[PDB]
Coordinates of C-alpha atoms and ligand atoms in Angstrom, one line a residue:
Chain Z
X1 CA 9.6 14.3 -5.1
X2 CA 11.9 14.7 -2.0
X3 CA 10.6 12.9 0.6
X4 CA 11.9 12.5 4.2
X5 CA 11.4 15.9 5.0
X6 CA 8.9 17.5 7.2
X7 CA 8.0 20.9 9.0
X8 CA 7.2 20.3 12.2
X9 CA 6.0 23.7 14.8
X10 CA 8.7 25.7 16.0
X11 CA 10.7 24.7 19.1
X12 CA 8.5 21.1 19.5
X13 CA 9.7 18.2 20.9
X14 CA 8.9 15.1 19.1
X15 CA 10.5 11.4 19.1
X16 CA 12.5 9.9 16.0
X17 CA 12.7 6.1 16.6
X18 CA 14.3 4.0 14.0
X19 CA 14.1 -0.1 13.2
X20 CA 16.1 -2.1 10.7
X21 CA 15.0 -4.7 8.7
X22 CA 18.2 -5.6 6.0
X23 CA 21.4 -7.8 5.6
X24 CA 23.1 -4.1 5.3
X25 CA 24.0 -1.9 8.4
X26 CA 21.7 1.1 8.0
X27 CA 22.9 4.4 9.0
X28 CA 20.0 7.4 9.5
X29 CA 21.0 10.7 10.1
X30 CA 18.3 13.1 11.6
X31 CA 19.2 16.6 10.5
X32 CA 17.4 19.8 12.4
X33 CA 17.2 23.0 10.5
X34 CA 19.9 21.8 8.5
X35 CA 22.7 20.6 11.2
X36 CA 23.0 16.7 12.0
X37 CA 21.6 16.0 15.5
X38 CA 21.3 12.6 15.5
X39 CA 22.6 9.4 14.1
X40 CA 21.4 6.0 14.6
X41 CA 23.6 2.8 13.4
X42 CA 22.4 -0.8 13.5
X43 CA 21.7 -4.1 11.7
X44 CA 19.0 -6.3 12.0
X45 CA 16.7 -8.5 9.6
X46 CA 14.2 -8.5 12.4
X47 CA 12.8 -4.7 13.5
X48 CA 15.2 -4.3 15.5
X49 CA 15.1 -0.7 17.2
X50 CA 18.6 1.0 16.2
X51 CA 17.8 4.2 17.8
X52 CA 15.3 6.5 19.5
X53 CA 15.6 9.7 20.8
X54 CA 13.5 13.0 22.4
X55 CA 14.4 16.2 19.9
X56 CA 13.8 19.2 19.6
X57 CA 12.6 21.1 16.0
X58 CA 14.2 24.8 17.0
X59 CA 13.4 27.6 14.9
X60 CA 12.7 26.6 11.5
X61 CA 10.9 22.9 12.4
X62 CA 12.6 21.4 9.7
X63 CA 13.4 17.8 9.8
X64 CA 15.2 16.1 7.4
X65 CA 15.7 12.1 7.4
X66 CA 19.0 10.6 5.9
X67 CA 19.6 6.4 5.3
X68 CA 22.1 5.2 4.0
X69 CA 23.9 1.6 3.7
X70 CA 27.5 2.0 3.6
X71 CA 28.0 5.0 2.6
X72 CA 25.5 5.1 -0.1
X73 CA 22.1 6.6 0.1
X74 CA 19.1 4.6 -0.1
X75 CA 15.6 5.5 -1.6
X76 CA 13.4 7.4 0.6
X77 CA 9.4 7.3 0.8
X78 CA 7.9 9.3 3.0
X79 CA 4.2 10.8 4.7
X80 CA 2.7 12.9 7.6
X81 CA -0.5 11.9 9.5
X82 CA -2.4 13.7 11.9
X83 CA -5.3 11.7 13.9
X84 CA -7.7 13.6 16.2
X85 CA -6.5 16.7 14.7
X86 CA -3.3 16.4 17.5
X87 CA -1.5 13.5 17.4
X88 CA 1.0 13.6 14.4
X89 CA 3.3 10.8 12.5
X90 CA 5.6 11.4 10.0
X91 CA 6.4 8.1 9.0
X92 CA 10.1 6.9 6.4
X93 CA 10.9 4.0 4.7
X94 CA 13.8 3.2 2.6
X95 CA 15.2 0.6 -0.1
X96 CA 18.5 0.3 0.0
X97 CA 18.4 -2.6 -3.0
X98 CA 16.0 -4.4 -5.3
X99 CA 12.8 -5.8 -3.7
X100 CA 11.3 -2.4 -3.1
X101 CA 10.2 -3.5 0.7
X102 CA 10.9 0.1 1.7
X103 CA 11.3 -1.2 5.2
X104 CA 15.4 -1.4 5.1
X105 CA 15.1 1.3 7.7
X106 CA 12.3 2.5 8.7
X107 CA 11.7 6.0 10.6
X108 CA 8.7 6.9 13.0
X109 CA 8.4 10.8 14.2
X110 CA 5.8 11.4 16.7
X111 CA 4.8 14.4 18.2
X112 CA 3.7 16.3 20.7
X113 CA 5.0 14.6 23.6
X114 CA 4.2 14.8 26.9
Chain T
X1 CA -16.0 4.5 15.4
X2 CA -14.0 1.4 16.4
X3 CA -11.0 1.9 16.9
X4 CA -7.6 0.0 17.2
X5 CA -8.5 -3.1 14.9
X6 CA -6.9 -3.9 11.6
X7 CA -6.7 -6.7 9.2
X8 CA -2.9 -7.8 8.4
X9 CA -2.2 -10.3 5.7
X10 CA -2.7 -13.7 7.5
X11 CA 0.8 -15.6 9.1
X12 CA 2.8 -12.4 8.5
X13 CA 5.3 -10.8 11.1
X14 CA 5.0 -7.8 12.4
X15 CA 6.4 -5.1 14.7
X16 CA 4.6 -3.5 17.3
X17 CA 6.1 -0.7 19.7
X18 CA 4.4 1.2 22.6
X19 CA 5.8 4.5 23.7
X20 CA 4.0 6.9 26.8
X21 CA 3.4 10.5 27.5
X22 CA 1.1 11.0 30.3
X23 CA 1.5 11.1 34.0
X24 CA -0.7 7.7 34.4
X25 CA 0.8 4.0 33.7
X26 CA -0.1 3.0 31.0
X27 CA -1.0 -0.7 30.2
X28 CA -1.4 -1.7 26.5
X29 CA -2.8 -4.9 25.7
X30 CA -2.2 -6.4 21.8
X31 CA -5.1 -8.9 20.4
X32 CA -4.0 -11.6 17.5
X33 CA -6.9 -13.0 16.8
X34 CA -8.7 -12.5 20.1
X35 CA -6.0 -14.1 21.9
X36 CA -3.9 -11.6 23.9
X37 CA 0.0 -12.0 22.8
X38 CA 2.0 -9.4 24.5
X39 CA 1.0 -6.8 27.6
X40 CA 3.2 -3.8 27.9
X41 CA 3.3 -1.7 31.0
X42 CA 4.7 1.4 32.4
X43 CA 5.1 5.4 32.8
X44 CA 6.6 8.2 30.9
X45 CA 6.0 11.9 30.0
X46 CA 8.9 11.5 27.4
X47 CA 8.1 9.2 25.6
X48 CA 9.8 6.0 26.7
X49 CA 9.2 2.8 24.9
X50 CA 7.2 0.7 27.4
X51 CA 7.3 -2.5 25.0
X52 CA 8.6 -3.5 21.3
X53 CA 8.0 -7.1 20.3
X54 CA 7.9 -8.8 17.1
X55 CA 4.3 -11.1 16.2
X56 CA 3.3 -13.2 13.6
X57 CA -0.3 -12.2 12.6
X58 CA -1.8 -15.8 12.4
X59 CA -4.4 -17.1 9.9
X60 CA -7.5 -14.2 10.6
X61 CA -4.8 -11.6 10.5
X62 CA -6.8 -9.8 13.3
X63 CA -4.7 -7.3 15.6
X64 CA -6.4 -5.6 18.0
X65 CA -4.9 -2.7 20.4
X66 CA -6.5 -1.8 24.1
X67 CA -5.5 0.8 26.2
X68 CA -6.1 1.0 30.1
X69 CA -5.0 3.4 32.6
X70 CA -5.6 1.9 36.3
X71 CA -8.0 -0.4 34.9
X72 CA -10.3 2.0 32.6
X73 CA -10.3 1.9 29.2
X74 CA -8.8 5.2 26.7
X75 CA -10.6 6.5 23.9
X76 CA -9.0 5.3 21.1
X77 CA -8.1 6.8 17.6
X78 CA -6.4 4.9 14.8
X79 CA -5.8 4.2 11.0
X80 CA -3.8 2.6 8.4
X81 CA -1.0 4.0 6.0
X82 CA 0.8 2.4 3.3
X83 CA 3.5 3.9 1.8
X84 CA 5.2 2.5 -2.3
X85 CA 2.2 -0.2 -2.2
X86 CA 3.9 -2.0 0.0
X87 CA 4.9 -0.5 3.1
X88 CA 2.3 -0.5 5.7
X89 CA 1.8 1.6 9.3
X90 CA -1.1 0.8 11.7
X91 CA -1.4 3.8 14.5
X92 CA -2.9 4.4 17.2
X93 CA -3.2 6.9 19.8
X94 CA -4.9 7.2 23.2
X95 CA -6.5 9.3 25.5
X96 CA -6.7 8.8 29.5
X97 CA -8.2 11.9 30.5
X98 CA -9.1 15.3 29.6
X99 CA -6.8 17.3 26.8
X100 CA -7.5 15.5 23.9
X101 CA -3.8 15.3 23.5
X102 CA -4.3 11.6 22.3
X103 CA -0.2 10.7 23.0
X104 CA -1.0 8.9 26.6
X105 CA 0.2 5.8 25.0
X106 CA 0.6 5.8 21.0
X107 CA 0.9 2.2 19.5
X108 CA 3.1 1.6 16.0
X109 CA 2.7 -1.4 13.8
X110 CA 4.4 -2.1 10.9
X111 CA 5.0 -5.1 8.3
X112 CA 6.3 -6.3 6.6
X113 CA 9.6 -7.4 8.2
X114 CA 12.9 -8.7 6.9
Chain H
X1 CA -13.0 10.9 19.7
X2 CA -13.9 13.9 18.3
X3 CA -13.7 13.3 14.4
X4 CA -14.1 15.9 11.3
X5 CA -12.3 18.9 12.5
X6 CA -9.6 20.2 11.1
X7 CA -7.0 23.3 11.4
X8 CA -5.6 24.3 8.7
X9 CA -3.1 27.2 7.5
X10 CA -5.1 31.1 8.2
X11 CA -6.7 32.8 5.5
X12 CA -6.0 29.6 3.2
X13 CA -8.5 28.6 -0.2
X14 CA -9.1 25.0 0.2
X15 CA -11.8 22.8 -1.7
X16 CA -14.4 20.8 0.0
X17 CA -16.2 17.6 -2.1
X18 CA -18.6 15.4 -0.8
X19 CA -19.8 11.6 -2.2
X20 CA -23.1 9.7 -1.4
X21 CA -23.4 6.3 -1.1
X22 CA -26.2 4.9 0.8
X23 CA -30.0 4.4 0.0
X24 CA -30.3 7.7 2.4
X25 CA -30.1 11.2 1.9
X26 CA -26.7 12.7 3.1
X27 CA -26.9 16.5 4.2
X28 CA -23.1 17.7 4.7
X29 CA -22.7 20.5 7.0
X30 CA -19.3 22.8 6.7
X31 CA -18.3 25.6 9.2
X32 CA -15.5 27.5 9.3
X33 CA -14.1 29.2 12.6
X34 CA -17.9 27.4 14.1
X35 CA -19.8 29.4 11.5
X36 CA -21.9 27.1 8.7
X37 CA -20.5 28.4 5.1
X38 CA -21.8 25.3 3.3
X39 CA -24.7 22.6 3.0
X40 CA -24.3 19.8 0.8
X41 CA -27.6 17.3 -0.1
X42 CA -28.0 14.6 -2.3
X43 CA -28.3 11.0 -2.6
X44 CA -27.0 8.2 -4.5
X45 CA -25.6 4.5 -4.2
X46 CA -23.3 5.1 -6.8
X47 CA -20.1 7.3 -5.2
X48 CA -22.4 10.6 -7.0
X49 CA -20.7 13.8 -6.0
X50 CA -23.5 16.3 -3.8
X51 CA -21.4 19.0 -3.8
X52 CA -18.0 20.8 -4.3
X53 CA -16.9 24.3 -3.5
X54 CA -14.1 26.5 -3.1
X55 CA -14.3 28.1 0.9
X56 CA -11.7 29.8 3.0
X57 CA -10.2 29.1 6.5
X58 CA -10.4 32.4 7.4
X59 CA -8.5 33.8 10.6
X60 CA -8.4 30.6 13.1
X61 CA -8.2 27.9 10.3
X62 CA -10.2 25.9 11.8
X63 CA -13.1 23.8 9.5
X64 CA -15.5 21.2 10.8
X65 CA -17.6 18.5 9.2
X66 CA -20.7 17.1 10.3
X67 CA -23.0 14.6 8.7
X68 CA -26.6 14.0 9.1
X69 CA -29.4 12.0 7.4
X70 CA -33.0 13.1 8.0
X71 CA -31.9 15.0 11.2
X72 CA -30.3 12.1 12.6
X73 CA -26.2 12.5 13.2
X74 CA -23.6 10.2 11.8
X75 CA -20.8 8.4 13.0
X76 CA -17.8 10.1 11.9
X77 CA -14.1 8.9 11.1
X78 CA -11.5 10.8 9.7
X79 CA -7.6 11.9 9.5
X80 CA -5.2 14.5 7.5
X81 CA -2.4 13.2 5.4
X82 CA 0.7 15.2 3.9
X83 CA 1.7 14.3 0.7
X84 CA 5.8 16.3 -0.1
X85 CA 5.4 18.2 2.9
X86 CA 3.0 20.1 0.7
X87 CA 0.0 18.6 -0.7
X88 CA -2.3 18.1 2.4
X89 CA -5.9 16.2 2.9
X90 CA -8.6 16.3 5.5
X91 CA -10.8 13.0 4.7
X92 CA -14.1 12.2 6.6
X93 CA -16.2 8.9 6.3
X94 CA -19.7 8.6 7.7
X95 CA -22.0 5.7 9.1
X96 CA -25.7 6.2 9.0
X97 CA -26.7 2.6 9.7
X98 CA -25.5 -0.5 10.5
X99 CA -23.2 -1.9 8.2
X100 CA -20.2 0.0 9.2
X101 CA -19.3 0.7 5.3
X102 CA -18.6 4.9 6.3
X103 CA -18.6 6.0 3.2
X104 CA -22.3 7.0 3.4
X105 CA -21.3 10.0 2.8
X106 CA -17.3 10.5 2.1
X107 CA -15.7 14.2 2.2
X108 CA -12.5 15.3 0.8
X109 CA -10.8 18.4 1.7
X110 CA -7.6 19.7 -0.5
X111 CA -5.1 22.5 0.1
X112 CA -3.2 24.4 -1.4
X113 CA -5.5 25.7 -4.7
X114 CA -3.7 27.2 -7.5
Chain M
X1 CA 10.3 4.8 -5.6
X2 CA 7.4 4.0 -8.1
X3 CA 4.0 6.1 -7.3
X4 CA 0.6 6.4 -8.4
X5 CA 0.1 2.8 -8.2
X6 CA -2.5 0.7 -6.0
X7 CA -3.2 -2.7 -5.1
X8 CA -7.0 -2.8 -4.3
X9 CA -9.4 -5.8 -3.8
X10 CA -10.3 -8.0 -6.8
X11 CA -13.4 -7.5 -8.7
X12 CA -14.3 -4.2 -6.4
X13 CA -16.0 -1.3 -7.6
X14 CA -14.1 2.3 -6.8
X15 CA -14.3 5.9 -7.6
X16 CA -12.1 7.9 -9.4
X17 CA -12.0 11.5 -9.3
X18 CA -9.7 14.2 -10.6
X19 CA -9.2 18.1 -9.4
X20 CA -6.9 20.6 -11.5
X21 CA -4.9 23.6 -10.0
X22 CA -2.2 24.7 -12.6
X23 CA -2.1 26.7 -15.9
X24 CA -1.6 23.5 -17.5
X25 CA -3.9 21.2 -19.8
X26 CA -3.4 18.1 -17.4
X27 CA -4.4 14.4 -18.7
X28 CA -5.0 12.2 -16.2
X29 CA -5.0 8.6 -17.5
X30 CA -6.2 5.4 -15.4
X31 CA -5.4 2.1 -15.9
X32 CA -7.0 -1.0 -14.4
X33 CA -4.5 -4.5 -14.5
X34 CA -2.3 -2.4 -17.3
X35 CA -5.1 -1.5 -19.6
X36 CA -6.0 2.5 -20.1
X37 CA -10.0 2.5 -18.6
X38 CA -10.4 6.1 -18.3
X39 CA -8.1 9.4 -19.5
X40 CA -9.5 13.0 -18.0
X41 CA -8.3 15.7 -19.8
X42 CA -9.1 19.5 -18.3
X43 CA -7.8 22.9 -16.9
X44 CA -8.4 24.7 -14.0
X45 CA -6.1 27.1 -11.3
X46 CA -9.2 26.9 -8.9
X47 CA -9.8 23.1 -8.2
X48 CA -12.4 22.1 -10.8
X49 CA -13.6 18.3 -11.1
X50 CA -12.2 17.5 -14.2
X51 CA -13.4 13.8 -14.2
X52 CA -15.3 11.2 -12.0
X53 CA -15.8 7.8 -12.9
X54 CA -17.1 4.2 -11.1
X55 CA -14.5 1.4 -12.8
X56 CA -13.9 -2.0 -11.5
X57 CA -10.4 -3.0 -10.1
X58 CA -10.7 -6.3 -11.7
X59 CA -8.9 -9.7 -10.8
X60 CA -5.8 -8.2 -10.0
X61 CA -6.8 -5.3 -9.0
X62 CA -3.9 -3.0 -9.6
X63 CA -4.7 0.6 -10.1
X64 CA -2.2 3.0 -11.5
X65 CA -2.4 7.1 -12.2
X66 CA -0.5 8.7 -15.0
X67 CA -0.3 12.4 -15.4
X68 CA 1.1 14.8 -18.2
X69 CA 1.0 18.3 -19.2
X70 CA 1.3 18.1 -23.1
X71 CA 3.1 14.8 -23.4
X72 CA 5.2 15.3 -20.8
X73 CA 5.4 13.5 -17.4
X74 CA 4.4 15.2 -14.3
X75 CA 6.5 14.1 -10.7
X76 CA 4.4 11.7 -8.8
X77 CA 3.1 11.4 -4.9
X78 CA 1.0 9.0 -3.2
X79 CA -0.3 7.1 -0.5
X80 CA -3.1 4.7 0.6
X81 CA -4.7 5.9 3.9
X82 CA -7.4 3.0 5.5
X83 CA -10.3 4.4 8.4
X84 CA -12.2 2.6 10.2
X85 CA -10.2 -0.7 9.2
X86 CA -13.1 -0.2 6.3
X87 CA -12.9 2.9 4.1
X88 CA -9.8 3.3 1.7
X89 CA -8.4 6.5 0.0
X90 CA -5.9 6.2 -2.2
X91 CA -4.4 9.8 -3.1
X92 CA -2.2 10.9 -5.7
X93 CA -0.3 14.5 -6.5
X94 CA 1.5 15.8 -9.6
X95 CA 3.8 18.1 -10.5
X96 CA 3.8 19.4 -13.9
X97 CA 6.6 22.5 -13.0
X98 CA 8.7 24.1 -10.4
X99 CA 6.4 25.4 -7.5
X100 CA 6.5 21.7 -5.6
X101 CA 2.8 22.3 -5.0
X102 CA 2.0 18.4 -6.1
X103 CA -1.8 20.0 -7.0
X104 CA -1.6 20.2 -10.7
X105 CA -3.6 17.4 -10.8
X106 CA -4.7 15.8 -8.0
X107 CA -6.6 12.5 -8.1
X108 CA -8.5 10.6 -5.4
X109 CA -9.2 7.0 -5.1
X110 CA -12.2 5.5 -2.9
X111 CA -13.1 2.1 -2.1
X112 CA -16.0 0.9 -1.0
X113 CA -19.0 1.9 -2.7
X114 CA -22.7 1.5 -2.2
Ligands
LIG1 O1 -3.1 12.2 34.0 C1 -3.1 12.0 32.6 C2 -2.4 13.2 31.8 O2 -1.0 13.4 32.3 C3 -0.5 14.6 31.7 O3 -1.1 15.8 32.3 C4 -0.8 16.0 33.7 C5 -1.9 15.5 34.6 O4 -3.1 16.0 34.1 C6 -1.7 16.1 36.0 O5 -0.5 15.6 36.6 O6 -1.8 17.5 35.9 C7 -0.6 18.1 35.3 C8 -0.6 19.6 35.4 O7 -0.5 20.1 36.7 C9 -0.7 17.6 33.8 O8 0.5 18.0 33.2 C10 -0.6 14.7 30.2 O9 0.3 13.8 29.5 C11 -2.0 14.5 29.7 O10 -2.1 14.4 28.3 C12 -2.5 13.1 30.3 O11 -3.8 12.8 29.7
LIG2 O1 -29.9 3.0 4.6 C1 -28.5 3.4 4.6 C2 -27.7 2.3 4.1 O2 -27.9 2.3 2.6 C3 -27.3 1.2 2.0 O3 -27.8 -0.1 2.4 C4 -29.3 -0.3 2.1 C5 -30.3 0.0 3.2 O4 -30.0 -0.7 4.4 C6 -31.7 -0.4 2.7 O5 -32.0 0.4 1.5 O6 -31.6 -1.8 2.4 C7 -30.8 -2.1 1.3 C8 -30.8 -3.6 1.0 O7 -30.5 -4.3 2.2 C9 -29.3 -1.7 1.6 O8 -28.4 -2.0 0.5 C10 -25.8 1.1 2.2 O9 -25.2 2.1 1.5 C11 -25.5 1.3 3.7 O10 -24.0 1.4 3.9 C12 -26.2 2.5 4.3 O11 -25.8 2.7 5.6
LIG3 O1 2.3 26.2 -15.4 C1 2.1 25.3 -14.4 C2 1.9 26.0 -13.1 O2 0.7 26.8 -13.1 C3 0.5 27.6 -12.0 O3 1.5 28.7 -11.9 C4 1.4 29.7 -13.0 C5 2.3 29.5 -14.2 O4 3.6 29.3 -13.7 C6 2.3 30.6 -15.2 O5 0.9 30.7 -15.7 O6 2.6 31.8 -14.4 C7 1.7 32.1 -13.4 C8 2.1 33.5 -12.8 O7 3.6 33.5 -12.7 C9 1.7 31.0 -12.3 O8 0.7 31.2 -11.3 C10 0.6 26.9 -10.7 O9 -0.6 26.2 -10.5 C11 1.8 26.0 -10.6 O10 1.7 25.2 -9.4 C12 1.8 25.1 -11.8 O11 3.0 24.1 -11.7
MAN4 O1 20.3 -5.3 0.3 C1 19.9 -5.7 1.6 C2 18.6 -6.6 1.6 O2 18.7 -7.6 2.7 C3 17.6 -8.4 2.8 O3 17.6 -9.4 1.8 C4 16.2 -7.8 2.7 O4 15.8 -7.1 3.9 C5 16.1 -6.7 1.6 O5 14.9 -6.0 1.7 C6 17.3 -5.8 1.7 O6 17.1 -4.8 0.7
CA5 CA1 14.8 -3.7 0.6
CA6 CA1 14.1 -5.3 3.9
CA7 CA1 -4.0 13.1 27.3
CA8 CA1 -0.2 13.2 27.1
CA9 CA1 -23.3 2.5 5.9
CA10 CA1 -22.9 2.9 2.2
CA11 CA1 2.9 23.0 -9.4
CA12 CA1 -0.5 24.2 -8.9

């Protein structure tokens, strides 16, 4: 299945915050209705927080998540949860070798804000 | 319900990160076994990170998240994902007054790390 | 929090499935848009499923579980997950006791049918 | 990334149940520590049960969900979602064609019983 795509309400703001946890420096592009409106570059072994940022989901509410190492795309795994019928998280990870940790980059989306 | 409590595999690392959205400070207190480990603090309706730290879960594997605004407790909602088998979220959200909004302060954990 | 209310999609076919476990008899009460549409009753320790019917949201989407044994209300917990952007389920556990178990009785909701 | 595949508790009883919504014969088959314990084989475009079993997870308690549509591999989603720090779904969708509805088969996972 694709994974690391999610309809979000029109016109929403919600936060994309991204950690890395890999020898390789992980790139995530955060594409909006199709068009790349953020991208967040960083190494760490240790969760570090390589980006976060306030967006906006315009028209269509699509957002797509992109990782890759390098140039080359890792695997993405992906789910939305909604708690208290409100408070929604849709949640990334990504393998960008062999050990299947899934947490080579790892992307949190929350929203509403506010 | 309780709220806020989950069991992590014992001496495992973890991330935890704090973000706000409310017009009250926020002050977010994280458990490990009973013994409070980090204390984050401060104001945002934008979702600013008020704390990311990286814990070690200890032998019960008991993390625990409170949320106080000026000194009274939030209503708390929470749960668990895991994503491939092996890539694990534990969320919660809060609520400091009346709109049900539940983003006043919303808590990530994730493990594993590395 | 409030617990076991859902919106979903308008005018949507969805399935509703309820499980008893607990020496006590579960009675499942479904409204849709704050109109009862459904009662499920039945008893077993066993994970028996007490009912399972095919409802829709109707124009405001919303539906709303309650749980009760002999009159007396349970403790509810629940969530929605997103599976593909597409496959989406609204999951309630109960507590009528002590023992904090909640799956006395344990309700699944699916959408999309077809 | 693999799917359909869950590490529960050793020696623990769980329900398995499984819903059809296609045009398609689906066979659902379940094994417990790599051993087939279970196969449902049904049709239905309007949600019906087409099985519900108690099986035991065993001593290593993996659990994984296999689904075809005359002996041919469906695509595979899933997740584990954990309330209450207690009650455990773990939820799987298939799709047997082109529609990227994931409900072809749909197969739900709880844990505990009694
Ligand atoms: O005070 C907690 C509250 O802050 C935010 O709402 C604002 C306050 O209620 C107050 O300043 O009134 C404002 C409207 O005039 C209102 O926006 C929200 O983040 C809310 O969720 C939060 O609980
Ligand atoms: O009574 C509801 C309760 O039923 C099941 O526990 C049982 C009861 O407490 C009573 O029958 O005593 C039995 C033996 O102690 C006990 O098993 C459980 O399903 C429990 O979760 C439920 O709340
Ligand atoms: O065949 C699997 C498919 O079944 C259902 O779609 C139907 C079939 O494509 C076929 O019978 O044509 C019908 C009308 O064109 C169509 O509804 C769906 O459940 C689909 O999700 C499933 O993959
Ligand atoms: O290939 C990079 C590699 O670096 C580290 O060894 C680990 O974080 C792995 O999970 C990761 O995949
Ligand atoms: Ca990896
Ligand atoms: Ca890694
Ligand atoms: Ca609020
Ligand atoms: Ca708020
Ligand atoms: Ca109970
Ligand atoms: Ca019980
Ligand atoms: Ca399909
Ligand atoms: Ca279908």
């Amino acid at each position: 299945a694709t994974q690391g795509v999610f309809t979000l309400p029109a016109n929403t703001q919600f936060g994309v915050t991204a950690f890395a946890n890999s020898a390789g420096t992980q790139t995530v592009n955060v594409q909006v209705n199709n068009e790349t409106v953020a991208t967040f570059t960083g190494q760490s072994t240790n969760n570090a927080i390589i980006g976060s940022k306030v967006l906006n989901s315009g028209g269509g509410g699509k957002v797509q998540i992109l990782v890759s190492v390098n140039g080359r795309s890792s695997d993405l795994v992906s789910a939305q949860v909604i708690l208290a019928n409100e408070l929604n998280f849709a949640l990334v990870g990504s393998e960008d070798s062999t050990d299947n940790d899934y947490n080579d980059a790892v992307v949190v989306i929350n929203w509403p804000l506010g």
